[PDB]
Ligand binder design. Structure first.
Ligand SMILES: *C(=N)[C@H](C[C@@H]1CCNC1=O)NC(=O)[C@@H]1[C@@H]2[C@H](CN1C(=O)[C@@H](NC(=O)C(F)(F)F)C(C)(C)C)C2(C)C
Ligand SMILES: *C(=N)[C@H](C[C@@H]1CCNC1=O)NC(=O)[C@@H]1[C@@H]2[C@H](CN1C(=O)[C@@H](NC(=O)C(F)(F)F)C(C)(C)C)C2(C)C
Lengths: 306, 306
């Protein structure tokens, strides 16, 4: 009963957040085993930010220059290295709260939870999607860098995002946990803009299945369509092309509801061409594209985590 | 930058969730110090549900009849009692992860985070409001009872909701942690319906301030209004009356933005009378009423928790 934007429980990630200070710059780090991962611009002064030479700035730091705090406890740094846009600080204490974890690089259209943090302390949790233009629509303030995005699978935390910056129009950009940016962005205070975004078609379809499961069925029409003819219509509305891989991922929801994917595609086609006529779907007056097929299955089936 | 529906970090509550089984009925419980709190209908069979005599059903239970599991560890029950609609099971082990906490009864219009759980294991977290008709718009499945709602203030978890049932139209009903229902509902499988709901005016105003803070300002008009004349208009649109207490609670946001509350009221008046004309505010095509003034301040100022 009901359908909500739902984040993963954040406790396993909360137990990994620390504060990292270098000079007067402070941000968040992620403490897993005996390594703290954080954005490399912790080593920048305000003026370094416009054209930083991170390798040069790091040459002039030693271990003791990094103040790492886990709650009230300072963690002694005993080694450091740079990997793309992330700093790795080896500390002399392994985090006893380290969960089973993976570093993953997610694909555009996939979702994750963000644990927004300031000064190593958690503020809140929310769900995001990696947009097709490789930005995310987050909520971040000064000092939020190093906050991470993640998914959970049973007991395993898959970390997929570390926060680095905000772009014009207010969308956000960051890296995977190997320090490689999503998209064509750099960690430098320089003129940068997101490309034009697109609507994540497979997710809109997932959310229409969630509507059917939850009893909101008014938009279901009596037609079908071919994949080619659907994509011709969707392209005009700045929807991303629907692939056979997308069709296959929708299979569980199609099987559960008894509505063929291409039938749902015909109903979406009508919504795009005619609008929703003042009506809502699952309480929204716009079509929602930040629920994946798995998000819908997980919420409508009550999948839990260890 | 950005504005999202944001839940509190759930870790402090995750460390309190357990599974409670009596006979063949299983639901979630909340383990604080040496007491487990859970919905009393854990003691009901399926047929007991329609007209249960909870006092009679509990007479025929003893401590050993309650199987309480915290992960892989069974907790021995050494005492039990009923308080309104909640069962309290004394166990022989105090929860070492008990946070500082309070039991509070919230008022209609206030928000909280829900940690949805199944079989004592967390599934996800989302933000809800206590509706003026004393229901909540949650997302719950079979076995979700005993999931709790809460707010956090620094290090203190204020528990305010325990989940018990779903009503027609799919809205949800439950109790405070003293077992007293919000609203005129009973924990019995009998014909019950929520009263007509109303829109939480002070929260819509809070969210318009959040829009201004985040740069979405198109709806700001050049007028003001009196409190009386605003409430005459709002009443027609099923908005709850705006009180002086509400005006006072909006004061921090008014001071931050330099927009007097009654000026924002004039802009809301225009939105109600004319609509949004295809435009969005903070990405939504409807006016949002499940952010409190404090929710907005907490998100736009980066308040963290210990
Ligand atoms: C990390 N704590 C912050 C997070 C920012 C701050 C406000 N909202 C956020 O998401 N990261 C930064 O301040 C980064 C950082 C230098 C400057 N910066 C920016 O986000 C700037 N953006 C850009 O320069 C642009 F447009 F290219 F993205 C700023 C103008 C300050 C918003 C570095 C190393 C990129
Ligand atoms: C607790 N695990 C469930 C949570 C429900 C289940 C599906 N979605 C939810 O939120 N609680 C119940 O099943 C409660 C419980 C008996 C029956 N019940 C209901 O929610 C029923 N609702 C009502 O009878 C009504 F309309 F009055 F609310 C049901 C028809 C099964 C949905 C008790 C003790 C009320």
């Amino acid at each position: 009963s009901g359908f909500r934007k739902m984040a993963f429980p954040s406790g396993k990630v909360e137990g990994c957040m620390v504060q990292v200070t270098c000079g007067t710059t402070t941000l968040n780090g992620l403490w897993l085993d005996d390594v703290v991962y954080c954005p490399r611009h912790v080593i920048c002064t305000s003026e370094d930010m416009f054209n930083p030479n991170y390798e040069d700035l790091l040459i002039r730091k030693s271990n003791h220059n990094f103040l790492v705090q886990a709650g009230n406890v300072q963690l002694r740094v005993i080694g450091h290295s740079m990997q793309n846009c992330v700093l790795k600080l080896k500390v002399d204490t392994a985090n006893p709260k380290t969960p089973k974890y993976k570093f993953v690089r997610i694909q555009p259209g996939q979702t994750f939870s963000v644990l927004a943090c300031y000064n190593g302390s958690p503020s809140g949790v929310y769900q995001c999607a990696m947009r097709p233009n490789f930005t995310i629509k987050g909520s971040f303030l000064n000092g939020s860098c190093g906050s991470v995005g993640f998914n959970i699978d049973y007991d395993c935390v898959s970390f997929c995002y570390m926060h680095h910056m905000v772009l014009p129009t207010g969308v956000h950009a960051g890296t995977d946990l190997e320090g490689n940016f999503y998209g064509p962005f750099v960690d430098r205070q320089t003129a940068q803009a997101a490309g034009t975004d697109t609507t994540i078609t497979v997710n809109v379809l997932a959310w229409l299945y969630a509507a059917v499961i939850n009893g909101d069925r008014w938009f279901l029409n009596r037609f079908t369509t071919t994949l080619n003819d659907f994509n011709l219509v969707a392209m005009k509305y700045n929807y991303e092309p629907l692939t056979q891989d997308h069709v296959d991922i929708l299979g569980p929801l199609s099987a559960q509801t008894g509505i063929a994917v291409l039938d749902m595609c015909a109903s979406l086609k009508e919504l795009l061409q005619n609008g929703m006529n003042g009506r809502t779907i699952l309480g929204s007056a716009l079509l929602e594209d930040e629920f994946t097929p798995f998000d819908v299955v997980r919420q409508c089936s009550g999948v839990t985590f260890q």
